[PDB]
Amino acid sequence: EIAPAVGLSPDFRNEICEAAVKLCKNVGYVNAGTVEFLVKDDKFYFIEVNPRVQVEHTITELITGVDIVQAQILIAQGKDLHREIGLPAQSEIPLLGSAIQCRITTEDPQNGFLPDTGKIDTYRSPGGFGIRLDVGNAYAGYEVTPYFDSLLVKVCTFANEFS
């Protein structure tokens, strides 16, 4: 997943964002949520709303500076986005570079993406400028079981330029 949609024009992206807002205004949407569209040749079509946070929220936090999960919790406490949580008006919402998220899993791509299981012997996580990690279950000694998803760690990168 990437953010923003760097391959589409900023006018067109903005039109998509307004359509999502219009829908949410109409129903009085509260808390975090996402509006999903399919896009084809400068037209766009609504497909679903996910009325919760999503796995890929991380990249939006990085290009806006906004902490979405904190925001969810503060909204649920009855707070005002602008007044108490501190978000600016729409036109002032930052747009800082771009960001990309990959999920690193035990899915084996040479075995039909079947998720591997067993013990983790070694786990060394990188860092530096432009790197964000949100770990799942991965640490030296951890036994990956077959009962849940195969996610080890989510990696995001961010920078001024997409490249």
Binding site: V53, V55, D67, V69, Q70, Q72, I73, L74, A76, Q77, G78, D134, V135, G136, N137, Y139, Y142, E143, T145, Y147, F148, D149, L151, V153, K154
Partner: protein, 82 residues
């Protein structure tokens, strides 16, 4: 403009596991809230269990995914933990 009664928080419980539970606990802590994890027996080594201020086993005797879908047991923990 109507805020539900009981919107003030001191302690929050994540009805989930793994990265998203850890992500929520981090936000909670940064907001000065205490946190509570739930875990199935088979998930007992999950990092999220040890990142919360408190944690409780749920779904005893069930299959592990059913444990995380055990509505009444999750509510039981939220109420018992305050």
């Amino acid at each position: 403009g109507l805020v539900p009664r009981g919107s003030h928080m001191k302690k929050l419980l994540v009805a989930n596991r793994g990265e998203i539970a850890v992500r929520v606990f981090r936000a909670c802590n940064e907001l000065g809230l205490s946190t509570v994890a739930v875990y199935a027996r088979e998930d007992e080594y999950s990092v999220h269990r040890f990142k919360a201020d408190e944690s409780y086993l749920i779904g005893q005797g069930k299959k592990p995914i059913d444990a995380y879908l055990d509505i009444d047991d999750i509510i039981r923990v939220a109420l018992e933990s305050g």
